[PDB]
Design a protein around this ligand. Structure first.
Ligand SMILES: NC(=[NH2+])NCCC[C@H](N)C(=O)O
Ligand SMILES: NC(=[NH2+])NCCC[C@H](N)C(=O)O
Lengths: 432, 432
């Protein structure tokens, strides 16, 4: 009889889940050993004070110090920061020593400078009131870090985070590592690692978020009134509804979608300025509108394109500045009218009351090019003209949630920004 | 009788072309007045020492100092630099004073710092052996600047360069400015401004480029032998042929495309290492290949995606790191094999001899996901499976022209980089 020592750093939930599963499947005596730092773990392995460790990114240098299994799983990787910053917002970043993260951040953000640390306390003091703007580290730090009032941004869908593997003192547990490898790749264990870990970390992040709601002292018994824009403009029970509602679920607030008939002349934004509703989306955050409501961070980025009569002047123009003498149709007070007024200063635009009228103008040769957002233009075709691929997307703008300009909305909007971050927006967008 | 004074700065070819055209059409006595600086021109206008000026970007502040016509034309705008740098490569940039360029560069590249100058000599000394890395200025500077051995990058398809207009002392030539405006927008004059100016500046840039060929001292009587990759891999008489051939035209070298049958086992790269041909494209600049040939700058950026059996495991995985236990098929020694070996370290990939065999493996359920480049995958469908939109483009890589590793190729490759810059690649790509 014996005992296999497997290394752990901080809250090593994947090492626990994986090796409990293995311990039990092969009837193995596992013994977890806490190491105060990830690089402590690495020395333990090549040395031999520990038999196994997980979550180690394989490298060519590394395979010459101790022996690797093939990658067994992903590793959730976060930017920890007071406020929830992004990578391209930092000039200092804390970096766990010995990790693959040194190379990753200099390869993708070489200007930031890294400051090395050892373990959670060191990381925590660097952040906890220090010079470091943010720390990049694994799921091991999530639970203790969010306790200390920190926020995260999941980096795995932001950067190519390499898969991860189980490792062993070189030439040591060769046969056992093989069996462990083959078991880990099984349909069962893989399905278990995907879901339980995702569930595990999303729950910690929800709890932190929900504690913020409570700390905000807003009345969660209040039914938030929501309106969705249904005047042909930019987007919509689709992308916007899912983001708003699921964010409302993220925060354990109750939201109710409300409608009448409206709107083409009965603006919902008026309802928002009335304070007769609390939330309105989508809203494309113009300049005109920027001050009349509070805004969540963006959650979609529409592609402005030009719609032209088919077969008309193809490849004559390669970008919209060369339309100096073409007739461009926009809708009055619409965001695209503003856009062109910046982009093509002092130029005559032709204004219309509606998309319908805007389109019919193009068809009647009243006008030659009209401004639409791509996704909306594809929609119209499904339910005789086309896009000028040459010019193509001449602009990318922002869609956000708007909140009524009062104290409640001031508190809601930053909260909704976080709920949106934690969402899988890409999936929703695809769906539609 | 009288005389209208219209302002000019340096080689103001658009002011000449436009106002000659107007002078003649309305029977007007024009008198050009050289101003040593663009901001000299502006003061002349609001003052009244000059009756007209062109190429002035309209602004809200500006319209309160002198009066604007509506935009009449675009303005070719260049980064001037020793070597031909790009904006995101500079920490210092020279900026003409009074221009719209101050605002444009800080809005798109705030980190660079601007250093103001007055006129071509000032600009030229800043560049000519100075601290400035590069100057951003209009077509006015093109001919004198390229004389002084400078290179350009056309910024108009790089940045939103606002259209441009004719301007006048405030409340002065009101009626005449109207007639001038309406004439300029005419089908005729517009067509004249598009083509003659484009022709004019492309010729100056060709001449500079061709002088470089001559200065290189390479034998332009030599017929360069070119091969195009025709083993299913990344791209191809299409994108690559147009870029290579038209670049060959750009440089007044003679290139001849050569083929046999080959190649799936008879690599053209071997022909390149043989020195039996001079040029090979496309070639996706791996690491494996990076040192065996000289490479032009990239001219296309393929989208690596995963091809999967239809209806199989949709939305189970959102990026390729989560394929740790899926069977991925690549071609042996292919670029994608290398890619995955970086991206999914120490993981078993299944290797094949060909695309054909790779595909049939996916169909035979030998394998579950295979790596293709998007454009190539669309091709196959046209002449039962699909892409995993969820993962989507998990990588963007580079396509370049490769040149044989000898002195001639060492000279050709940098030259071909310039010829490619001056090309309209977007148009070619579209076409295909
Ligand atoms: N205890 C940890 N998982 N620390 C982070 C490790 C990061 C990365 N997987 C590496 O081995 O370089
Ligand atoms: N002579 C010139 N065109 N100088 C550049 C002017 C740049 C820009 N059109 C402006 O008026 O601000």
């Amino acid at each position: 009889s014996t005992t296999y020592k497997v290394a752990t750093e901080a809250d090593d939930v994947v090492t626990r889940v994986l090796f409990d599963s293995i311990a039990h499947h092969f009837n193995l005596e596992i013994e977890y050993v806490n190491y105060p730092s990830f690089n402590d773990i690495l020395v333990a392995i090549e040395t031999g004070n520990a038999d196994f460790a997980a979550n180690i990114t394989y490298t060519d240098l590394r395979a010459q110090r101790f022996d690797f299994s093939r990658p067994t799983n992903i590793e959730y990787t976060y930017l920890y920061s007071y406020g929830g910053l992004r990578l391209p917002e930092l000039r200092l970043v804390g970096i766990p020593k010995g990790t693959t993260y040194g190379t990753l951040l200099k390869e993708h953000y070489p200007y930031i400078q890294q400051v090395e640390y050892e373990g959670h306390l060191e990381a925590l003091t660097l952040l906890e009131s220090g010079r470091v703007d943010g720390v990049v580290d694994a799921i091991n730090q999530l639970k203790p870090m969010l306790l200390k009032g920190l926020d995260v941004q999941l980096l795995n869908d932001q950067l190519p985070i390499q898969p991860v593997s189980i490792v062993t003192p070189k030439g040591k547990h060769s046969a056992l590592l093989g069996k462990i490898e083959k078991y880990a790749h099984s349909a069962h264990v893989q399905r278990l690692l995907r879901e339980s870990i995702q569930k595990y970390q999303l729950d910690i992040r929800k709890q932190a978020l929900r504690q913020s709601v409570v700390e905000s002292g807003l009345n969660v018994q209040r039914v938030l009134r929501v309106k969705l824009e249904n005047n042909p403009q930019y987007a919509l029970r689709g992308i916007s509804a899912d983001v708003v509602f699921q964010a409302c679920e993220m925060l354990l607030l109750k939201c109710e979608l409300v409608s009448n008939g409206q709107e083409t002349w009965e603006s919902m934004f008026d309802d928002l300025q009335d304070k007769s509703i609390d939330i309105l989306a989508p809203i494309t955050v113009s300049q005109q509108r920027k001050n009349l409501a509070y805004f969540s961070e963006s959650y979609y980025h529409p592609q402005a394109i030009l719609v032209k009569r088919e077969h008309y002047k193809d490849d004559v123009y390669s970008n919209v500045s060369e339309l100096v003498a073409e007739r461009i149709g926009v809708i009055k007070d619409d965001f695209f009218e503003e856009l062109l007024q910046q982009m093509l200063p002092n130029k005559i635009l032709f204004s219309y009351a509606s998309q319908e009228e805007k389109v019919q103008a193009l068809l009647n040769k009243e006008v030659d090019y009209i401004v639409l957002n791509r996704a909306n233009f594809n929609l119209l075709l499904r339910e005789p003209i086309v896009e000028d691929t040459m010019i193509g997307s001449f602009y990318q703008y922002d869609i956000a949630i708007g909140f009524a300009k009062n104290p409640l909305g001031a508190t809601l909007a930053p909260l909704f920004s976080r709920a949106i971050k934690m969402l899988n927006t890409e999936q929703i967008i695809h769906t539609y």
